[PDB]
Design a protein that fits this description.
monomer; alpha+beta; Aminopeptidase; 7-stranded mixed β-sheet; 8 helices; 7 strands; globular; binds coenzyme A; transferase; Dopamine N-acetyltransferase(Dat); GCN5-related N-acetyltransferase(GNAT)
């Protein structure tokens, strides 16, 4: 069973795109809480969204003895915003993107870390259901620390839409620096998202490595 089983942690390469997408379609596309709530289904926009940060060379896969991807954490570099969703044609993903834009409008991680210019952003985290509860997500997260140290990056920022991913980060010493309860997210005056308990809100997590 999964409990005894070895896996490696490896850098995700460009040619890994299709394998990453196939895994995410089985898992993340269906079981990330906002995706679950909306019943996302087929979503090319999220596929492209997931592939986008790969060239930053700081995304990692967990791979079992059969050579199958059993977990991923896709990360990209994020830069201090300057003062200076709309083109998304997938109606369900558009709502998710709008929420993400809203969080950014309400909270700027660079205000918490005024001396930082570049921060690591943990964008997509997914572990095969069969292998959950083994700390794989934590292993994937810790792998990025090596990248951060090599590159003089001090802060790892992870926006969580799951209470379970928030727990992964909490175990690693990330702190929740901003919360937006789904019940309070009322653009145009009405609740857009009501995901299943215990997923009560967006939990923005930050680690100073
Ligand atoms: C979030 C996720 C990546 C965690 O991966 P993981 O490798 O299982 O992480 P952990 O082993 O540290 O488990 C974290 C918590 O998940 C919870 N959990 C949820 N389902 C579980 C299950 N099937 N098995 C065991 N734990 C589970 C546990 O509360 C656990 O906390 P604990 O260590 O205090 O018991 C995984 O649950 C997942 O893929 N969820 C669906 C996609 C998603 O929501 N991604 C994050 C969006 S921000």
């Amino acid at each position: 069973g999964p409990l005894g089983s070895p896996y490696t942690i490896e850098l995700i390469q460009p040619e890994d795109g299709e394998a990453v997408i196939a895994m995410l379609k089985t898992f993340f596309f269906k079981d990330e809480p906002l995706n679950t709530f909306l019943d996302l289904g087929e979503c090319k926009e999220l596929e492209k969204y997931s592939l986008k940060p790969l060239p930053d060379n700081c995304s990692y896969k967990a791979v079992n003895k059969k050579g199958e991807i059993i977990g991923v954490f896709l990360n990209g570099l994020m830069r201090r915003p300057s003062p200076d969703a709309d083109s998304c044609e997938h109606p369900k993903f558009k709502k998710i993107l709008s929420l993400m834009d809203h969080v950014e409008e309400q909270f700027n991680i660079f205000d918490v870390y005024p001396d930082e210019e570049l921060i690591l952003d943990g964008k997509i985290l997914s572990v095969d259901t069969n292998y959950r509860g083994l700390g794989i997500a934590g292993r994937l997260t810790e792998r990025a620390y090596e990248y951060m140290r090599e590159n003089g990056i001090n802060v790892y920022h992870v926006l969580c839409s799951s209470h379970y991913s928030a727990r992964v980060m909490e175990k690693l010493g990330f702190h929740e620096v901003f919360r937006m309860q789904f019940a309070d997210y009322k653009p145009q005056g009405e609740v857009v998202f009501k995901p299943a308990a215990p997923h009560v809100g967006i939990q923005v997590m930050a680690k100073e490595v």
